[PDB]
PDB file of all heavy atoms in Angstrom:
ATOM      1  N   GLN A   1     110.702 107.267  70.701  1.00  0.00           N
ATOM      2  CA  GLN A   1     109.521 107.696  69.958  1.00  0.00           C
ATOM      3  C   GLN A   1     108.798 108.880  70.593  1.00  0.00           C
ATOM      4  O   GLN A   1     108.426 109.825  69.892  1.00  0.00           O
ATOM      5  CB  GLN A   1     108.541 106.534  69.819  1.00  0.00           C
ATOM      6  CG  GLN A   1     109.079 105.368  69.015  1.00  0.00           C
ATOM      7  CD  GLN A   1     108.059 104.258  68.867  1.00  0.00           C
ATOM      8  OE1 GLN A   1     107.142 104.345  68.054  1.00  0.00           O
ATOM      9  NE2 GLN A   1     108.213 103.205  69.662  1.00  0.00           N
ATOM     10  N   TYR A   2     108.600 108.834  71.912  1.00  0.00           N
ATOM     11  CA  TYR A   2     107.729 109.797  72.603  1.00  0.00           C
ATOM     12  C   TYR A   2     108.426 110.650  73.667  1.00  0.00           C
ATOM     13  O   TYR A   2     107.765 111.447  74.340  1.00  0.00           O
ATOM     14  CB  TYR A   2     106.560 109.051  73.251  1.00  0.00           C
ATOM     15  CG  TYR A   2     106.030 107.891  72.431  1.00  0.00           C
ATOM     16  CD1 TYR A   2     106.075 106.588  72.916  1.00  0.00           C
ATOM     17  CD2 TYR A   2     105.485 108.105  71.167  1.00  0.00           C
ATOM     18  CE1 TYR A   2     105.589 105.531  72.168  1.00  0.00           C
ATOM     19  CE2 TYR A   2     105.001 107.050  70.413  1.00  0.00           C
ATOM     20  CZ  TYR A   2     105.052 105.762  70.916  1.00  0.00           C
ATOM     21  OH  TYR A   2     104.569 104.714  70.171  1.00  0.00           O
ATOM     22  N   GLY A   3     109.737 110.499  73.824  1.00  0.00           N
ATOM     23  CA  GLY A   3     110.480 111.218  74.858  1.00  0.00           C
ATOM     24  C   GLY A   3     110.375 110.537  76.215  1.00  0.00           C
ATOM     25  O   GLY A   3     109.810 109.451  76.327  1.00  0.00           O
ATOM     26  N   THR A   4     110.914 111.195  77.241  1.00  0.00           N
ATOM     27  CA  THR A   4     111.005 110.616  78.586  1.00  0.00           C
ATOM     28  C   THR A   4     109.635 110.144  79.098  1.00  0.00           C
ATOM     29  O   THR A   4     108.666 110.906  79.057  1.00  0.00           O
ATOM     30  CB  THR A   4     111.605 111.623  79.594  1.00  0.00           C
ATOM     31  OG1 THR A   4     112.835 112.147  79.072  1.00  0.00           O
ATOM     32  CG2 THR A   4     111.877 110.963  80.943  1.00  0.00           C
ATOM     33  N   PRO A   5     109.553 108.886  79.575  1.00  0.00           N
ATOM     34  CA  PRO A   5     108.311 108.369  80.144  1.00  0.00           C
ATOM     35  C   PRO A   5     108.114 108.803  81.594  1.00  0.00           C
ATOM     36  O   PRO A   5     109.085 109.094  82.293  1.00  0.00           O
ATOM     37  CB  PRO A   5     108.508 106.854  80.083  1.00  0.00           C
ATOM     38  CG  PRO A   5     109.977 106.676  80.236  1.00  0.00           C
ATOM     39  CD  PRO A   5     110.616 107.862  79.568  1.00  0.00           C
ATOM     40  N   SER A   6     106.859 108.834  82.032  1.00  0.00           N
ATOM     41  CA  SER A   6     106.534 109.117  83.425  1.00  0.00           C
ATOM     42  C   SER A   6     106.781 107.882  84.295  1.00  0.00           C
ATOM     43  O   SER A   6     106.891 106.766  83.782  1.00  0.00           O
ATOM     44  CB  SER A   6     105.070 109.556  83.546  1.00  0.00           C
ATOM     45  OG  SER A   6     104.188 108.514  83.171  1.00  0.00           O
ATOM     46  N   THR A   7     106.874 108.086  85.606  1.00  0.00           N
ATOM     47  CA  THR A   7     107.012 106.976  86.550  1.00  0.00           C
ATOM     48  C   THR A   7     105.753 106.100  86.520  1.00  0.00           C
ATOM     49  O   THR A   7     105.846 104.882  86.607  1.00  0.00           O
ATOM     50  CB  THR A   7     107.261 107.471  87.988  1.00  0.00           C
ATOM     51  OG1 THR A   7     108.363 108.395  87.995  1.00  0.00           O
ATOM     52  CG2 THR A   7     107.573 106.313  88.926  1.00  0.00           C
ATOM     53  N   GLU A   8     104.594 106.743  86.391  1.00  0.00           N
ATOM     54  CA  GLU A   8     103.323 106.036  86.243  1.00  0.00           C
ATOM     55  C   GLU A   8     103.364 105.089  85.042  1.00  0.00           C
ATOM     56  O   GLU A   8     102.907 103.949  85.137  1.00  0.00           O
ATOM     57  CB  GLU A   8     102.169 107.035  86.088  1.00  0.00           C
ATOM     58  CG  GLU A   8     100.783 106.408  86.115  1.00  0.00           C
ATOM     59  CD  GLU A   8      99.657 107.424  85.985  1.00  0.00           C
ATOM     60  OE1 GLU A   8      99.810 108.406  85.222  1.00  0.00           O
ATOM     61  OE2 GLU A   8      98.614 107.237  86.643  1.00  0.00           O
ATOM     62  N   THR A   9     103.911 105.568  83.926  1.00  0.00           N
ATOM     63  CA  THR A   9     104.037 104.758  82.707  1.00  0.00           C
ATOM     64  C   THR A   9     104.941 103.540  82.932  1.00  0.00           C
ATOM     65  O   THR A   9     104.629 102.443  82.464  1.00  0.00           O
ATOM     66  CB  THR A   9     104.570 105.596  81.521  1.00  0.00           C
ATOM     67  OG1 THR A   9     103.583 106.563  81.141  1.00  0.00           O
ATOM     68  CG2 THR A   9     104.900 104.721  80.310  1.00  0.00           C
ATOM     69  N   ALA A  10     106.048 103.738  83.638  1.00  0.00           N
ATOM     70  CA  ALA A  10     106.972 102.648  83.952  1.00  0.00           C
ATOM     71  C   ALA A  10     106.305 101.599  84.840  1.00  0.00           C
ATOM     72  O   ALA A  10     106.480 100.402  84.634  1.00  0.00           O
ATOM     73  CB  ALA A  10     108.220 103.187  84.631  1.00  0.00           C
ATOM     74  N   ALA A  11     105.548 102.065  85.829  1.00  0.00           N
ATOM     75  CA  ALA A  11     104.796 101.182  86.715  1.00  0.00           C
ATOM     76  C   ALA A  11     103.759 100.360  85.946  1.00  0.00           C
ATOM     77  O   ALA A  11     103.544  99.189  86.255  1.00  0.00           O
ATOM     78  CB  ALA A  11     104.117 101.990  87.809  1.00  0.00           C
ATOM     79  N   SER A  12     103.132 100.981  84.955  1.00  0.00           N
ATOM     80  CA  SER A  12     102.120 100.313  84.140  1.00  0.00           C
ATOM     81  C   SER A  12     102.719  99.178  83.322  1.00  0.00           C
ATOM     82  O   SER A  12     102.123  98.108  83.210  1.00  0.00           O
ATOM     83  CB  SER A  12     101.425 101.318  83.216  1.00  0.00           C
ATOM     84  OG  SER A  12     100.429 100.683  82.431  1.00  0.00           O
ATOM     85  N   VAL A  13     103.903  99.410  82.760  1.00  0.00           N
ATOM     86  CA  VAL A  13     104.596  98.387  81.970  1.00  0.00           C
ATOM     87  C   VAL A  13     104.991  97.212  82.869  1.00  0.00           C
ATOM     88  O   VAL A  13     104.855  96.055  82.471  1.00  0.00           O
ATOM     89  CB  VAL A  13     105.830  98.962  81.229  1.00  0.00           C
ATOM     90  CG1 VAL A  13     106.608  97.868  80.516  1.00  0.00           C
ATOM     91  CG2 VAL A  13     105.400 100.015  80.216  1.00  0.00           C
ATOM     92  N   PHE A  14     105.471  97.510  84.074  1.00  0.00           N
ATOM     93  CA  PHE A  14     105.742  96.475  85.079  1.00  0.00           C
ATOM     94  C   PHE A  14     104.480  95.675  85.400  1.00  0.00           C
ATOM     95  O   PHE A  14     104.514  94.446  85.445  1.00  0.00           O
ATOM     96  CB  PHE A  14     106.272  97.088  86.378  1.00  0.00           C
ATOM     97  CG  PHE A  14     107.768  97.185  86.448  1.00  0.00           C
ATOM     98  CD1 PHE A  14     108.411  98.416  86.352  1.00  0.00           C
ATOM     99  CD2 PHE A  14     108.537  96.048  86.652  1.00  0.00           C
ATOM    100  CE1 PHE A  14     109.788  98.502  86.435  1.00  0.00           C
ATOM    101  CE2 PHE A  14     109.917  96.129  86.738  1.00  0.00           C
ATOM    102  CZ  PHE A  14     110.543  97.356  86.624  1.00  0.00           C
ATOM    103  N   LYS A  15     103.377  96.385  85.639  1.00  0.00           N
ATOM    104  CA  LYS A  15     102.096  95.766  85.996  1.00  0.00           C
ATOM    105  C   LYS A  15     101.599  94.834  84.901  1.00  0.00           C
ATOM    106  O   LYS A  15     101.169  93.718  85.183  1.00  0.00           O
ATOM    107  CB  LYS A  15     101.042  96.838  86.296  1.00  0.00           C
ATOM    108  CG  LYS A  15      99.626  96.304  86.542  1.00  0.00           C
ATOM    109  CD  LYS A  15      98.695  96.331  85.333  1.00  0.00           C
ATOM    110  CE  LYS A  15      98.808  97.600  84.498  1.00  0.00           C
ATOM    111  NZ  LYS A  15      97.611  97.828  83.641  1.00  0.00           N
ATOM    112  N   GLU A  16     101.671  95.299  83.658  1.00  0.00           N
ATOM    113  CA  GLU A  16     101.192  94.517  82.512  1.00  0.00           C
ATOM    114  C   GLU A  16     101.882  93.154  82.462  1.00  0.00           C
ATOM    115  O   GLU A  16     101.233  92.134  82.227  1.00  0.00           O
ATOM    116  CB  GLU A  16     101.414  95.289  81.199  1.00  0.00           C
ATOM    117  CG  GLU A  16     100.407  94.956  80.107  1.00  0.00           C
ATOM    118  CD  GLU A  16      99.011  95.487  80.388  1.00  0.00           C
ATOM    119  OE1 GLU A  16      98.838  96.280  81.343  1.00  0.00           O
ATOM    120  OE2 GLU A  16      98.076  95.112  79.654  1.00  0.00           O
ATOM    121  N   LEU A  17     103.193  93.142  82.695  1.00  0.00           N
ATOM    122  CA  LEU A  17     103.971  91.901  82.701  1.00  0.00           C
ATOM    123  C   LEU A  17     103.644  91.017  83.904  1.00  0.00           C
ATOM    124  O   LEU A  17     103.530  89.801  83.758  1.00  0.00           O
ATOM    125  CB  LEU A  17     105.470  92.218  82.689  1.00  0.00           C
ATOM    126  CG  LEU A  17     106.002  92.917  81.439  1.00  0.00           C
ATOM    127  CD1 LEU A  17     107.417  93.431  81.677  1.00  0.00           C
ATOM    128  CD2 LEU A  17     105.965  91.985  80.234  1.00  0.00           C
ATOM    129  N   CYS A  18     103.503  91.627  85.079  1.00  0.00           N
ATOM    130  CA  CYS A  18     103.219  90.883  86.314  1.00  0.00           C
ATOM    131  C   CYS A  18     101.790  90.338  86.367  1.00  0.00           C
ATOM    132  O   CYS A  18     101.565  89.221  86.840  1.00  0.00           O
ATOM    133  CB  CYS A  18     103.485  91.767  87.538  1.00  0.00           C
ATOM    134  SG  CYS A  18     105.227  92.198  87.792  1.00  0.00           S
ATOM    135  N   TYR A  19     100.826  91.122  85.881  1.00  0.00           N
ATOM    136  CA  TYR A  19      99.422  90.715  85.903  1.00  0.00           C
ATOM    137  C   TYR A  19      99.127  89.626  84.875  1.00  0.00           C
ATOM    138  O   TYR A  19      98.559  88.584  85.212  1.00  0.00           O
ATOM    139  CB  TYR A  19      98.510  91.923  85.655  1.00  0.00           C
ATOM    140  CG  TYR A  19      97.035  91.578  85.634  1.00  0.00           C
ATOM    141  CD1 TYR A  19      96.366  91.226  86.804  1.00  0.00           C
ATOM    142  CD2 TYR A  19      96.308  91.600  84.447  1.00  0.00           C
ATOM    143  CE1 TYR A  19      95.021  90.905  86.790  1.00  0.00           C
ATOM    144  CE2 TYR A  19      94.959  91.285  84.427  1.00  0.00           C
ATOM    145  CZ  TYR A  19      94.322  90.935  85.603  1.00  0.00           C
ATOM    146  OH  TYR A  19      92.983  90.622  85.584  1.00  0.00           O
ATOM    147  N   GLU A  20      99.524  89.865  83.627  1.00  0.00           N
ATOM    148  CA  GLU A  20      99.222  88.944  82.530  1.00  0.00           C
ATOM    149  C   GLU A  20      99.966  87.607  82.659  1.00  0.00           C
ATOM    150  O   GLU A  20      99.518  86.599  82.121  1.00  0.00           O
ATOM    151  CB  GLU A  20      99.526  89.588  81.168  1.00  0.00           C
ATOM    152  CG  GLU A  20      98.715  90.840  80.852  1.00  0.00           C
ATOM    153  CD  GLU A  20      97.221  90.572  80.685  1.00  0.00           C
ATOM    154  OE1 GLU A  20      96.825  89.416  80.426  1.00  0.00           O
ATOM    155  OE2 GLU A  20      96.432  91.538  80.816  1.00  0.00           O
ATOM    156  N   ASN A  21     101.091  87.608  83.376  1.00  0.00           N
ATOM    157  CA  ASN A  21     101.862  86.384  83.637  1.00  0.00           C
ATOM    158  C   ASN A  21     101.894  86.005  85.130  1.00  0.00           C
ATOM    159  O   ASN A  21     102.889  85.480  85.622  1.00  0.00           O
ATOM    160  CB  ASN A  21     103.288  86.536  83.095  1.00  0.00           C
ATOM    161  CG  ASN A  21     103.322  86.807  81.604  1.00  0.00           C
ATOM    162  OD1 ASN A  21     103.130  85.897  80.793  1.00  0.00           O
ATOM    163  ND2 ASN A  21     103.581  88.058  81.225  1.00  0.00           N
ATOM    164  N   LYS A  22     100.793  86.254  85.834  1.00  0.00           N
ATOM    165  CA  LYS A  22     100.713  85.994  87.282  1.00  0.00           C
ATOM    166  C   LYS A  22     100.846  84.509  87.651  1.00  0.00           C
ATOM    167  O   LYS A  22     101.376  84.182  88.717  1.00  0.00           O
ATOM    168  CB  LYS A  22      99.411  86.563  87.872  1.00  0.00           C
ATOM    169  CG  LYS A  22      98.121  85.974  87.316  1.00  0.00           C
ATOM    170  CD  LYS A  22      96.918  86.317  88.179  1.00  0.00           C
ATOM    171  CE  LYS A  22      96.525  87.781  88.067  1.00  0.00           C
ATOM    172  NZ  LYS A  22      95.511  88.140  89.094  1.00  0.00           N
ATOM    173  N   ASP A  23     100.362  83.625  86.779  1.00  0.00           N
ATOM    174  CA  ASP A  23     100.421  82.177  87.014  1.00  0.00           C
ATOM    175  C   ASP A  23     101.850  81.629  87.020  1.00  0.00           C
ATOM    176  O   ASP A  23     102.138  80.643  87.692  1.00  0.00           O
ATOM    177  CB  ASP A  23      99.600  81.421  85.956  1.00  0.00           C
ATOM    178  CG  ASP A  23      98.110  81.703  86.043  1.00  0.00           C
ATOM    179  OD1 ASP A  23      97.653  82.307  87.041  1.00  0.00           O
ATOM    180  OD2 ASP A  23      97.387  81.311  85.099  1.00  0.00           O
ATOM    181  N   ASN A  24     102.742  82.275  86.266  1.00  0.00           N
ATOM    182  CA  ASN A  24     104.109  81.780  86.062  1.00  0.00           C
ATOM    183  C   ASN A  24     105.204  82.628  86.726  1.00  0.00           C
ATOM    184  O   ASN A  24     106.390  82.328  86.570  1.00  0.00           O
ATOM    185  CB  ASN A  24     104.387  81.673  84.560  1.00  0.00           C
ATOM    186  CG  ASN A  24     103.377  80.803  83.837  1.00  0.00           C
ATOM    187  OD1 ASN A  24     103.164  79.648  84.214  1.00  0.00           O
ATOM    188  ND2 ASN A  24     102.748  81.342  82.791  1.00  0.00           N
TER     189      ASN A  24
END
């Protein structure tokens, strides 16, 4: 959709998954 993502963007997607599911 938007072309090559930045490394910052990749880190953010990782963070979103790790933070929102920190309990599990």
